Scaffold this active site. Structure first.
Site, PDB file in Angstrom:
ATOM      1  N   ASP A  29     -10.174  20.426 -10.573  1.00  0.00           N
ATOM      2  CA  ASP A  29     -10.819  20.760  -9.737  1.00  0.00           C
ATOM      3  C   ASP A  29     -11.755  19.480  -9.312  1.00  0.00           C
ATOM      4  O   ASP A  29     -12.105  19.201  -8.054  1.00  0.00           O
ATOM      5  CB  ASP A  29     -12.154  21.730  -9.819  1.00  0.00           C
ATOM      6  CG  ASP A  29     -11.598  23.149 -10.072  1.00  0.00           C
ATOM      7  OD1 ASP A  29     -10.865  23.554  -9.148  1.00  0.00           O
ATOM      8  OD2 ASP A  29     -11.773  23.924 -11.006  1.00  0.00           O
ATOM      9  N   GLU A  63     -10.528  20.092  -5.709  1.00  0.00           N
ATOM     10  CA  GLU A  63     -10.751  21.407  -5.005  1.00  0.00           C
ATOM     11  C   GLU A  63     -11.017  21.429  -3.278  1.00  0.00           C
ATOM     12  O   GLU A  63     -12.064  20.646  -3.202  1.00  0.00           O
ATOM     13  CB  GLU A  63     -11.578  22.372  -5.888  1.00  0.00           C
ATOM     14  CG  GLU A  63     -11.526  23.751  -5.478  1.00  0.00           C
ATOM     15  CD  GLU A  63     -10.299  24.335  -5.524  1.00  0.00           C
ATOM     16  OE1 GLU A  63      -9.764  24.993  -6.626  1.00  0.00           O
ATOM     17  OE2 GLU A  63      -9.541  24.515  -4.486  1.00  0.00           O
TER      18      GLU A  63
HETATM   19 MN   LIG Z   1     -11.243  25.898 -11.158  1.00  0.00          MN
HETATM   20 MN   LIG Z   2      -8.838  24.381  -8.615  1.00  0.00          MN
END
Ligand SMILES: [Mn+2]
Ligand SMILES: [Mn+2]
Ligand SMILES: Oc1ccc(/C=N/Nc2ccc(Cl)cc2)c(O)c1O
Length: 181
Positions: A93, A65
Site C-alpha cells: 500500500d 494503493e
Molecule cells: Mn492493504
Molecule cells: Mn493494497
C-alpha cells in the site's frame, strides 16, 4: 427505522477523489459497484486509511494503493531500483522512505490478530511491514512497531469509528460488517 442505501452513503461519506479511485479500482477488476456495494464501501475505507496514514507525515510515504495496477508496479519497481529495496511479491500500500520499507495496511472487523497472521502468511516477506486497524480501535503491527505516533493513529481510528457510527445510524453496519472476507 429506515434502511438507507450503501451507495448513497459512500457518495456522501467519502471524498469525491476516494470514490472515483474506488470506482476505477472496481472497474479495473470488472466489478459492479451497484451490486457489490459493501465492497465499494470497504475499498473506499481502506483507501482513506492509506491516505490518512500517508498524510500523517507528508512526503515520508510514497502511496502505491489507488494507482492503476500497471502504474503501481512501475512505482514499486522504481522505488526498488532507487533505494535498493527488495521487490515485493504482491502490491503493497505504501513505501516508508524513513524506515526504508514497504507497508501493507489492513482494515478489518475480524479478530485483529488472526487478520494480521493471514496477511503475514500471504505476503511472506521479512521486509514488508504490516499494520492492521480494526473498526474496534484495535491495531496490530509487525514487531509491535506502530510507525506513526498515537495522535496520528487516533485520528485514523476516530475516522473508522465515525464511519461505523454513520453506517449504523442508517442501518447499514450489520450488512457491511457481515460482508467482509
Ligand atoms: Mn492493504
Ligand atoms: Mn493494497
Ligand atoms: O470480493 C469481495 C466481496 C465483498 C467484500 C466486502 N468486504 N467488506 C468489508 C471488508 C472489510 C471490512 Cl472491515 C468490512 C466489510 C470484499 O472485501 C471482497 O473482497
Amino acid at each position: 427505522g429506515p434502511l438507507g442505501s450503501m451507495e448513497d452513503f459512500v457518495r456522501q461519506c467519502f471524498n469525491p477523489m476516494i470514490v472515483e479511485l474506488a470506482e476505477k479500482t472496481m472497474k479495473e477488476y470488472g466489478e459492479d459497484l451497484k451490486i457489490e456495494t459493501n465492497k465499494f464501501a470497504a475499498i473506499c475505507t481502506h483507501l482513506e486509511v492509506c491516505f490518512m496514514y500517508s498524510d500523517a507525515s507528508k512526503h515520508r510515504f510514497e502511496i502505491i494503493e489507488g494507482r492503476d495496477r500497471t502504474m503501481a508496479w512501475t512505482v514499486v519497481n522504481s522505488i526498488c531500483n532507487t533505494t535498493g529495496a527488495e521487490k515485493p511479491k504482491f502490491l503493497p500500500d505504501l513505501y516508508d522512505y524513513k524506515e526504508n520499507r514497504f507497508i501493507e495496511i489492513g482494515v478489518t472487523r475480524r479478530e485483529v490478530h488472526i487478520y494480521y497472521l493471514e496477511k503475514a502468511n500471504k505476503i511472506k516477506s521479512e521486509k514488508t511491514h504490516i499494520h492492521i486497524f480494526s473498526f474496534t480501535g484495535e491495531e496490530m503491527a509487525t514487531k509491535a512497531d506502530y510507525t506513526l505516533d498515537e495522535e496520528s493513529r487516533a485520528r485514523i481510528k476516530t475516522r473508522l469509528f465515525t464511519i461505523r457510527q454513520e453506517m449504523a445510524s442508517r442501518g447499514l453496519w450489520d450488512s457491511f460488517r457481515q460482508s467482509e472476507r
